[PDB]
Amino acid sequence: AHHHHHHKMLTPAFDLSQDPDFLTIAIRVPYARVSEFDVYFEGSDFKFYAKPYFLRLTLPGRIVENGSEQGSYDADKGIFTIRLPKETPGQHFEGLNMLTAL
């Protein structure tokens, strides 16, 4: 037997990874109705916009603003990736596996 639970802006699924220089956020946007996306970051705050998607995260550490962030999109897979430079090089961000949309 199957039971489905259903609980409009969408919150996108996403996957996180890191190395000592960057935090990488890969955002699943298959149902995007735009081909232009906007990202804002400030300290540990992260926002991503692409109608109908909105994603806000509080990151486990801070990101530096110096224009060195790296954005790219894969139209085949429907995934936007942003690499965000760590304010403290070598800081290992903890608990990424349980980070959840604000």
Swiss-Prot record:
Subcellular location: Cytoplasm, Cytosol; Nucleus, Nucleoplasm
Whole-protein residues included: 1 to 94 of 577
Positions of the CS domain: 9-97
Gene: SHQ1
Family: Belongs to the SHQ1 family.
Function field: Required for the quantitative accumulation of H/ACA ribonucleoproteins (RNPs), including telomerase, probably through the stabilization of DKC1, from the time of its synthesis until its association with NOP10, NHP2, and NAF1 at the nascent H/ACA RNA.
Assembly and oligomerization: Directly interacts with DKC1 alone, but not in the context of the core trimer composed of DKC1, NOP10 and NHP2, nor in the presence of NAF1. Does not interact with NAF1.
UniProt superkingdom: Eukaryota
Disease tied to this protein: Dystonia 35, childhood-onset: A form of dystonia, a disorder defined by the presence of sustained involuntary muscle contraction, often leading to abnormal postures. DYT35 is an autosomal recessive form characterized by the onset of a dystonic movement disorder in the first year of life. Neurodevelopmental disorder with dystonia and seizures: An autosomal recessive disorder characterized by global developmental delay, inability to walk or speak, profoundly impaired intellectual development, and early-onset dystonia. Additional features may include other extrapyramidal movements, seizures or seizure-like activity, and cerebellar hypoplasia on brain imaging.
Record protein name field: Protein SHQ1 homolog
Span of the signal peptide: none
